[PDB]
């Protein structure tokens, strides 16, 4: 147990793929238990998005502000590691893109 997500400002956008449930606040909690902030909007202190089958639009704006754009299986990873995991390992997905 450790802040070791202290330095990321995350905006989380996790639904099932059929957008009828939105699990955005089970890995909002997980993130913040690491230390981490979770912004409520996706403003310019934003480091990093979580995204599983968001809106097209935060797909296109973390892609065109470059962000560090990541998979649900990064916060898996970065708690079951215990440690900041290079986010280059977990690309998000878009089926749409
Ligand atoms: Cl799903």
Redesign the pocket.
Known sequence: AAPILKDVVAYVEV????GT?NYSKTFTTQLVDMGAKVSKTFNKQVTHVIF??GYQSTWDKAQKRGVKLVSVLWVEKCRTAGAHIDESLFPAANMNE
């Open positions: 639904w099932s793929s059929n449930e599983k089958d």
